[PDB]
Write an enzyme that holds these catalytic residues in place. Sequence first.
Site, PDB file in Angstrom:
ATOM      1  N   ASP A 251     -30.282  -3.104  16.703  1.00 34.47           N
ATOM      2  CA  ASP A 251     -29.929  -2.402  15.471  1.00 34.47           C
ATOM      3  C   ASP A 251     -30.375  -0.937  15.485  1.00 34.47           C
TER       4      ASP A 251
ATOM      5  N   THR B  70     -24.874  -1.670   8.818  1.00 33.43           N
ATOM      6  CA  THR B  70     -25.239  -2.758   9.721  1.00 33.43           C
ATOM      7  C   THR B  70     -24.256  -3.922   9.647  1.00 33.43           C
TER       8      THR B  70
ATOM      9  N   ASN C 249     -22.891  -2.755   3.042  1.00 33.86           N
ATOM     10  CA  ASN C 249     -24.056  -3.639   2.861  1.00 33.86           C
ATOM     11  C   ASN C 249     -24.127  -4.170   1.443  1.00 33.86           C
TER      12      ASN C 249
ATOM     13  N   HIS D 213     -24.944   0.949  15.276  1.00 38.45           N
ATOM     14  CA  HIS D 213     -24.701   2.346  14.826  1.00 38.45           C
ATOM     15  C   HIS D 213     -25.916   3.096  15.285  1.00 38.45           C
TER      16      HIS D 213
ATOM     17  N   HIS E  39     -28.388   6.153   8.162  1.00 40.28           N
ATOM     18  CA  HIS E  39     -27.106   6.108   8.848  1.00 40.28           C
ATOM     19  C   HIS E  39     -26.101   5.637   7.804  1.00 40.28           C
TER      20      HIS E  39
ATOM     21  N   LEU F 210      -0.051   0.816   7.677  1.00 43.79           N
ATOM     22  CA  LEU F 210       1.190   0.296   8.258  1.00 43.79           C
ATOM     23  C   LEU F 210       2.448   0.922   7.658  1.00 43.79           C
TER      24      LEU F 210
ATOM     25  N   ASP G 249       5.648   1.822   5.726  1.00 45.17           N
ATOM     26  CA  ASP G 249       6.282   1.273   4.534  1.00 45.17           C
ATOM     27  C   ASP G 249       7.764   1.062   4.793  1.00 45.17           C
TER      28      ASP G 249
HETATM   29  C1  LIG Z   1      -5.846  -5.174  11.739  1.00 45.44           C
HETATM   30  O1  LIG Z   1      -5.658  -6.539  12.058  1.00 45.44           O
HETATM   31  C2  LIG Z   1      -5.438  -7.438  10.992  1.00 45.44           C
HETATM   32  C3  LIG Z   1      -5.300  -8.855  11.549  1.00 45.44           C
HETATM   33  O2  LIG Z   1      -4.343  -8.859  12.593  1.00 45.44           O
HETATM   34  C4  LIG Z   1      -4.168  -7.079  10.221  1.00 45.44           C
HETATM   35  O3  LIG Z   1      -4.237  -7.792   9.006  1.00 45.44           O
HETATM   36  C5  LIG Z   1      -3.183  -8.756   8.846  1.00 45.44           C
HETATM   37  O4  LIG Z   1      -2.020  -8.130   8.349  1.00 45.44           O
HETATM   38  C6  LIG Z   1      -0.912  -8.953   7.985  1.00 45.44           C
HETATM   39  C7  LIG Z   1       0.096  -8.043   7.281  1.00 45.44           C
HETATM   40  O5  LIG Z   1      -0.595  -7.102   6.459  1.00 45.44           O
HETATM   41  C8  LIG Z   1      -1.278 -10.153   7.073  1.00 45.44           C
HETATM   42  O6  LIG Z   1      -0.203 -11.097   7.012  1.00 45.44           O
HETATM   43  C9  LIG Z   1      -0.077 -11.678   5.680  1.00 45.44           C
HETATM   44  O7  LIG Z   1      -0.665 -12.973   5.561  1.00 45.44           O
HETATM   45  C10 LIG Z   1      -0.748 -13.468   4.230  1.00 45.44           C
HETATM   46  C11 LIG Z   1      -1.587 -14.745   4.173  1.00 45.44           C
HETATM   47  O8  LIG Z   1      -2.752 -14.512   4.932  1.00 45.44           O
HETATM   48  C12 LIG Z   1      -3.872 -15.383   4.621  1.00 45.44           C
HETATM   49  O9  LIG Z   1      -4.215 -16.172   5.752  1.00 45.44           O
HETATM   50  C13 LIG Z   1      -4.751 -15.440   6.857  1.00 45.44           C
HETATM   51  C14 LIG Z   1      -4.843 -16.322   8.111  1.00 45.44           C
HETATM   52  O10 LIG Z   1      -5.985 -17.170   8.127  1.00 45.44           O
HETATM   53  C15 LIG Z   1      -5.935 -18.110   9.239  1.00 45.44           C
HETATM   54  O11 LIG Z   1      -5.937 -17.489  10.523  1.00 45.44           O
HETATM   55  C16 LIG Z   1      -5.832 -18.368  11.650  1.00 45.44           C
HETATM   56  C17 LIG Z   1      -4.718 -17.880  12.584  1.00 45.44           C
HETATM   57  O12 LIG Z   1      -5.217 -16.811  13.371  1.00 45.44           O
HETATM   58  C18 LIG Z   1      -5.701 -19.844  11.232  1.00 45.44           C
HETATM   59  O13 LIG Z   1      -5.667 -20.702  12.361  1.00 45.44           O
HETATM   60  C19 LIG Z   1      -6.872 -20.210  10.300  1.00 45.44           C
HETATM   61  O14 LIG Z   1      -6.702 -21.527   9.811  1.00 45.44           O
HETATM   62  C20 LIG Z   1      -7.065 -19.149   9.187  1.00 45.44           C
HETATM   63  O15 LIG Z   1      -7.169 -19.700   7.889  1.00 45.44           O
HETATM   64  C21 LIG Z   1      -6.078 -14.782   6.449  1.00 45.44           C
HETATM   65  O16 LIG Z   1      -6.629 -14.051   7.525  1.00 45.44           O
HETATM   66  C22 LIG Z   1      -5.890 -13.875   5.219  1.00 45.44           C
HETATM   67  O17 LIG Z   1      -7.162 -13.399   4.792  1.00 45.44           O
HETATM   68  C23 LIG Z   1      -7.072 -12.145   4.063  1.00 45.44           C
HETATM   69  O18 LIG Z   1      -7.218 -12.287   2.655  1.00 45.44           O
HETATM   70  C24 LIG Z   1      -8.469 -12.776   2.167  1.00 45.44           C
HETATM   71  C25 LIG Z   1      -8.590 -12.323   0.712  1.00 45.44           C
HETATM   72  O19 LIG Z   1      -7.865 -13.208  -0.115  1.00 45.44           O
HETATM   73  C26 LIG Z   1      -9.722 -12.335   2.954  1.00 45.44           C
HETATM   74  O20 LIG Z   1     -10.641 -13.407   3.051  1.00 45.44           O
HETATM   75  C27 LIG Z   1      -9.480 -11.796   4.370  1.00 45.44           C
HETATM   76  O21 LIG Z   1     -10.533 -10.916   4.696  1.00 45.44           O
HETATM   77  C28 LIG Z   1      -8.115 -11.118   4.509  1.00 45.44           C
HETATM   78  O22 LIG Z   1      -8.070  -9.985   3.642  1.00 45.44           O
HETATM   79  C29 LIG Z   1      -7.348  -8.822   4.135  1.00 45.44           C
HETATM   80  O23 LIG Z   1      -5.921  -8.948   4.197  1.00 45.44           O
HETATM   81  C30 LIG Z   1      -5.216  -9.086   2.954  1.00 45.44           C
HETATM   82  C31 LIG Z   1      -3.707  -9.151   3.201  1.00 45.44           C
HETATM   83  O24 LIG Z   1      -3.351 -10.443   3.651  1.00 45.44           O
HETATM   84  C32 LIG Z   1      -5.554  -7.984   1.934  1.00 45.44           C
HETATM   85  O25 LIG Z   1      -5.210  -8.440   0.639  1.00 45.44           O
HETATM   86  C33 LIG Z   1      -7.040  -7.589   1.912  1.00 45.44           C
HETATM   87  O26 LIG Z   1      -7.163  -6.313   1.320  1.00 45.44           O
HETATM   88  C34 LIG Z   1      -7.747  -7.607   3.280  1.00 45.44           C
HETATM   89  O27 LIG Z   1      -7.506  -6.399   3.971  1.00 45.44           O
HETATM   90  C35 LIG Z   1      -5.101 -14.596   4.101  1.00 45.44           C
HETATM   91  O28 LIG Z   1      -5.975 -15.431   3.357  1.00 45.44           O
HETATM   92  C36 LIG Z   1       0.667 -13.688   3.702  1.00 45.44           C
HETATM   93  O29 LIG Z   1       0.575 -14.133   2.366  1.00 45.44           O
HETATM   94  C37 LIG Z   1       1.505 -12.395   3.805  1.00 45.44           C
HETATM   95  O30 LIG Z   1       2.868 -12.629   3.432  1.00 45.44           O
HETATM   96  C38 LIG Z   1       3.249 -11.905   2.218  1.00 45.44           C
HETATM   97  O31 LIG Z   1       3.791 -10.610   2.464  1.00 45.44           O
HETATM   98  C39 LIG Z   1       5.024 -10.619   3.190  1.00 45.44           C
HETATM   99  C40 LIG Z   1       5.477  -9.182   3.458  1.00 45.44           C
HETATM  100  O32 LIG Z   1       6.438  -9.200   4.496  1.00 45.44           O
HETATM  101  C41 LIG Z   1       6.129 -11.436   2.495  1.00 45.44           C
HETATM  102  O33 LIG Z   1       7.190 -11.692   3.394  1.00 45.44           O
HETATM  103  C42 LIG Z   1       5.633 -12.780   1.956  1.00 45.44           C
HETATM  104  O34 LIG Z   1       6.576 -13.211   0.998  1.00 45.44           O
HETATM  105  C43 LIG Z   1       4.240 -12.684   1.316  1.00 45.44           C
HETATM  106  O35 LIG Z   1       4.396 -12.013   0.068  1.00 45.44           O
HETATM  107  C44 LIG Z   1       4.016 -12.796  -1.098  1.00 45.44           C
HETATM  108  O36 LIG Z   1       2.867 -12.283  -1.762  1.00 45.44           O
HETATM  109  C45 LIG Z   1       2.994 -10.954  -2.271  1.00 45.44           C
HETATM  110  C46 LIG Z   1       1.664 -10.531  -2.899  1.00 45.44           C
HETATM  111  O37 LIG Z   1       1.146 -11.557  -3.723  1.00 45.44           O
HETATM  112  C47 LIG Z   1       4.171 -10.815  -3.255  1.00 45.44           C
HETATM  113  O38 LIG Z   1       4.467  -9.446  -3.465  1.00 45.44           O
HETATM  114  C48 LIG Z   1       5.446 -11.539  -2.787  1.00 45.44           C
HETATM  115  O39 LIG Z   1       6.353 -11.657  -3.874  1.00 45.44           O
HETATM  116  C49 LIG Z   1       5.155 -12.905  -2.128  1.00 45.44           C
HETATM  117  O40 LIG Z   1       4.806 -13.871  -3.106  1.00 45.44           O
HETATM  118  C50 LIG Z   1       1.381 -11.731   5.204  1.00 45.44           C
HETATM  119  O41 LIG Z   1       2.159 -12.388   6.190  1.00 45.44           O
HETATM  120  C51 LIG Z   1      -2.602 -10.834   7.481  1.00 45.44           C
HETATM  121  O42 LIG Z   1      -3.107 -11.605   6.400  1.00 45.44           O
HETATM  122  C52 LIG Z   1      -3.692  -9.840   7.879  1.00 45.44           C
HETATM  123  N1  LIG Z   1      -4.848 -10.551   8.416  1.00 45.44           N
HETATM  124  C53 LIG Z   1      -6.131 -10.220   8.158  1.00 45.44           C
HETATM  125  C54 LIG Z   1      -7.211 -11.050   8.801  1.00 45.44           C
HETATM  126  O43 LIG Z   1      -6.471  -9.282   7.437  1.00 45.44           O
HETATM  127  C55 LIG Z   1      -4.166  -5.580   9.902  1.00 45.44           C
HETATM  128  O44 LIG Z   1      -2.888  -5.197   9.444  1.00 45.44           O
HETATM  129  C56 LIG Z   1      -4.569  -4.676  11.060  1.00 45.44           C
HETATM  130  N2  LIG Z   1      -4.700  -3.327  10.535  1.00 45.44           N
HETATM  131  C57 LIG Z   1      -4.070  -2.295  11.107  1.00 45.44           C
HETATM  132  C58 LIG Z   1      -4.237  -0.935  10.472  1.00 45.44           C
HETATM  133  O45 LIG Z   1      -3.393  -2.395  12.129  1.00 45.44           O
HETATM  134 CA   LIG Z   2       2.053   0.697   4.339  1.00 44.14          CA
HETATM  135 ZN   LIG Z   3     -27.855  -1.685  11.576  1.00 41.36          ZN
HETATM  136 ZN   LIG Z   4     -30.664   0.858   8.979  1.00 41.62          ZN
END
Ligand SMILES: *[C@@H]1O[C@H](CO)[C@@H](O[C@@H]2O[C@H](CO)[C@@H](O[C@@H]3O[C@H](CO[C@H]4O[C@H](CO[C@H]5O[C@H](CO)[C@@H](O)[C@H](O)[C@@H]5O)[C@@H](O)[C@H](O[C@H]5O[C@H](CO)[C@@H](O)[C@H](O)[C@@H]5O[C@H]5O[C@H](CO)[C@@H](O)[C@H](O)[C@@H]5O)[C@@H]4O)[C@@H](O)[C@H](O[C@H]4O[C@H](CO)[C@@H](O)[C@H](O)[C@@H]4O[C@H]4O[C@H](CO)[C@@H](O)[C@H](O)[C@@H]4O)[C@@H]3O)[C@H](O)[C@H]2NC(C)=O)[C@H](O)[C@H]1NC(C)=O
Ligand SMILES: [Ca+2]
Ligand SMILES: [Zn+2]
Ligand SMILES: [Zn+2]
EC number: 3.1.4.39
Length: 803
Positions: free
Chosen positions: A121, A159, A180, A309, A420, A689, A691
């Site tokens: 750390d 951290t 944190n 860090h 930090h 990403l 739009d």
């Molecule tokens: C960096 O990398 C990461 C990871 O690769 C990139 O992040 C990914 O980006 C994807 C697109 O943005 C996104 O796809 C989503 O998925 C939605 C459901 O996702 C949930 O499940 C996830 C998977 O968990 C499982 O994973 C493994 C497989 O590897 C399984 O085997 C396990 O069993 C696991 O359970 C899960 O990771 C995810 O967790 C997020 O949300 C939680 C909060 O509730 C947090 O705990 C967690 O930290 C994650 O939070 C982040 O991501 C969410 C966005 O998902 C965001 O809100 C937070 O701010 C945070 O940043 C989920 O629990 C799925 O619903 C999506 O589909 C919707 O949108 C599409 C658009 O095309 C529609 O077609 C579709 O209809 C649907 O829309 C519906 O809902 C809308 C809103 O309500 C509504 O408007 C509409 O009408 C519809 O009803 C979509 O496919 C990934 O979830 C995401 N993954 C992660 C881990 O973040 C990231 O982009 C990269 N960044 C860069 C800059 O490159």
């Molecule tokens: Ca965007």
């Molecule tokens: Zn630290």
């Molecule tokens: Zn420290």
Amino acid sequence: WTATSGSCKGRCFELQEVGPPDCRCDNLCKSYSSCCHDFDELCLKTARGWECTKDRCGEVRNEENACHCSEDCLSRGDCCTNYQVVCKGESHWVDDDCEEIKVPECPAGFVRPPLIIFSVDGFRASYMKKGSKVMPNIEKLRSCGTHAPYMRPVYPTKTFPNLYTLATGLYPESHGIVGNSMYDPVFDASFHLRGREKFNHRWWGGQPLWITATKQGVRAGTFFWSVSIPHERRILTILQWLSLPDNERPSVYAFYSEQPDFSGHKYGPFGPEMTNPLREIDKTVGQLMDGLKQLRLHRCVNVIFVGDHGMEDVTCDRTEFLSNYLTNVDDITLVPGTLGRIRAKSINNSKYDPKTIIAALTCKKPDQHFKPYMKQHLPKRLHYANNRRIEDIHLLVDRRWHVARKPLDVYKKCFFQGDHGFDNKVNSMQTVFVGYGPTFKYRTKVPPFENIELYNVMCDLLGLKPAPNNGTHGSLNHLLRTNTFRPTMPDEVSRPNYPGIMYLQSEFDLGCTCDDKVENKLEELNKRLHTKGSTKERHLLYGRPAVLYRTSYDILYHTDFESGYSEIFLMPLWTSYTISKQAEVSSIPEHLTNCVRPDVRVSPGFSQNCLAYKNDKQMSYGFLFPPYLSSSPEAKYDAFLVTNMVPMYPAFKRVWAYFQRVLVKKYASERNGVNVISGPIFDYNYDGLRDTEDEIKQYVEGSSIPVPTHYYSIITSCLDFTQPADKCDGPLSVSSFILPHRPDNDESCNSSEDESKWVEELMKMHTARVRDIEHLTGLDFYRKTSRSYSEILTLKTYLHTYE
Ligand SMILES: *[C@@H]1O[C@H](CO)[C@@H](O[C@@H]2O[C@H](CO)[C@@H](O[C@@H]3O[C@H](CO[C@H]4O[C@H](CO[C@H]5O[C@H](CO)[C@@H](O)[C@H](O)[C@@H]5O)[C@@H](O)[C@H](O[C@H]5O[C@H](CO)[C@@H](O)[C@H](O)[C@@H]5O[C@H]5O[C@H](CO)[C@@H](O)[C@H](O)[C@@H]5O)[C@@H]4O)[C@@H](O)[C@H](O[C@H]4O[C@H](CO)[C@@H](O)[C@H](O)[C@@H]4O[C@H]4O[C@H](CO)[C@@H](O)[C@H](O)[C@@H]4O)[C@@H]3O)[C@H](O)[C@H]2NC(C)=O)[C@H](O)[C@H]1NC(C)=O
Ligand SMILES: [Ca+2]
Ligand SMILES: [Zn+2]
Ligand SMILES: [Zn+2]
Ligand SMILES: O=C(/C=C/c1ccc(OC(F)(F)F)cc1)N1CC[C@@H]2CN(C(=O)N3CCc4[nH]ncc4C3)C[C@@H]2CC1
């Protein structure tokens, strides 16, 4: 509730976790206050210490001892780590000349080389060189193995964000641990360093290395260690696990040291008191490596030495107080320190307004040591916006400084000399990486890289398939001897159209004018070849960017540039041109000031029009290929085509014009020519990403012309600058930026001055990776080079830092 009446007899540091309300014996039972009554007696023995002395050699096994020097100790897997040195005349690992490990040399029944992550750390990158005299073990790891001069942490350089990023390959915005300390408005719950909410599953997103391994049949040690367990006991516990039977033995482990961060906070990064924590860490590495030697694993195990860090000099007296800026200070909540996050104190106060908060924080004091941003305007390289836990208002704080709410928060809570958390490109925040072992290269320096990239490598080190993450798999193949993952180029989704001349001038009703009507077999056949692509090899040096989504676009060729024009967004997605060292800057002639020309290759319905810019009083326009760089008077008219035009705010035009008129030529001179690719970015939902068309929040008034949130450029030349950009045989060199398209220049406090005092400063703050632009555009660059694809991936992750 815990019925602590069970026992840890033969259960010390058990791997599976037993559920409540039974008592635990794992390396985290202290932190949960749930250890069995006899945990300390049995599992944390201390008697006689950590080292064998001459008089203990061949002793009779006494089970009470912390570790053992009895003849049976090797079979039991529980000798003190220096047992062979004292009692068998073996030498310490550090004293052996280092010899390349060309093949893993593992003991029978080891299916793969194990991986040990040694995490430290607050281990600032410069400690590697500055402390090398007092760290012989770490210095042997570094110089015999594979090392980076530094590793870039994620923002905030705290951290928990950084440790969880290392484990997941994700930006904090995605894994959910954005500091944190956090408030989640949907849960209505707070996450704290001290307390019980942080143990809740709901906070932790993505899929960390230990879970990825488990689901794929690779067994893991438990990574985390309660503070009160001494480091010597951590090392011995890992060595005992390595002595378990094949079917029970984990393949991945982690050690963790609270040092040197802990002392760093008290003494500063180079306080003379910092030598001792650095000695101590090194002693611990020595114990590990000596311990692995005894087990005959020292040429079998891959070891990663890695920090979260750095550390900076920071005192009480360098604090800015929000109470010297705001009247309504009691209306806000501030998350303070080396970064600031502001939100309203009560949800039931409607006299709270962010616009006025930002304004009151904006360039108010000559020497100001923090800058406010709405989170969407933060530099995109920080990727710190797309989480409901990140407050809309953010303060970026200068290295060496703090922000606090009121002065009382600081004297009724100097104590500390180090901290930090600052912007992750700040030098003092950088940290270390060293890989050592059979799968890593031998005596190899690799360029700096970001911690988001490690999850992929650690997965490769173990034969695992990484979960989707933010690394670019293959970008770190040059650290590895073997076990390479050999990525392929993504396939192009949309192919381009190649329009010829299809429209007469009079078919256009765009409200534009140009004085171009002033008018040759040889020279007309020749400009025709230019429109068919005759100079494209000069201007498109690495192939055309592939469009990785479903869209409709045209390639447009010209003497001086080439573009991919989108019929949907009514502008280029990219424009590409080369500027040699010898190229001259000209000005825009008097008669062509307001000149915009219809493009006879593109239908009126797929064009911008000048009237929309006439009517819209906030919006002006600018050009992607700059007229200032036209190769000839005749070529200059190409730069005025309506298909080279993009919407720009008059304040942003200030920035762009200086970039195109002065800086591009400057880089050409300094780098021996440059190739430039420029374009718009639309990211209204701030997720990093591209739009889609139905997500555009702002158009030029009265039209379907979308307004970009950002403009990027990518500037490529030869790494060996004795060769010109257009004739490079070897590796490439790149720098990029993603400039936010803002209607004012409030970000730069000295902007009422000449562009030469503030523009380049702004661009440096918005430096970017080609990879960053890729996510934002859905384009894939460098499709046609003579370089290996892994090398190209590395180029795309490069960030030019100017530190
Ligand atoms: C960096 O990398 C990461 C990871 O690769 C990139 O992040 C990914 O980006 C994807 C697109 O943005 C996104 O796809 C989503 O998925 C939605 C459901 O996702 C949930 O499940 C996830 C998977 O968990 C499982 O994973 C493994 C497989 O590897 C399984 O085997 C396990 O069993 C696991 O359970 C899960 O990771 C995810 O967790 C997020 O949300 C939680 C909060 O509730 C947090 O705990 C967690 O930290 C994650 O939070 C982040 O991501 C969410 C966005 O998902 C965001 O809100 C937070 O701010 C945070 O940043 C989920 O629990 C799925 O619903 C999506 O589909 C919707 O949108 C599409 C658009 O095309 C529609 O077609 C579709 O209809 C649907 O829309 C519906 O809902 C809308 C809103 O309500 C509504 O408007 C509409 O009408 C519809 O009803 C979509 O496919 C990934 O979830 C995401 N993954 C992660 C881990 O973040 C990231 O982009 C990269 N960044 C860069 C800059 O490159
Ligand atoms: Ca965007
Ligand atoms: Zn630290
Ligand atoms: Zn420290
Ligand atoms: O020993 C560790 C960490 C080891 C480690 C090693 C390598 C890593 O990186 C990677 F991935 F590269 F290997 C990441 C972490 N820590 C981490 C810091 C906090 C965490 N914590 C908690 O109390 N909690 C945090 C996590 C957790 N799991 N279960 C409860 C809790 C709460 C107290 C305290 C104990 C010490």
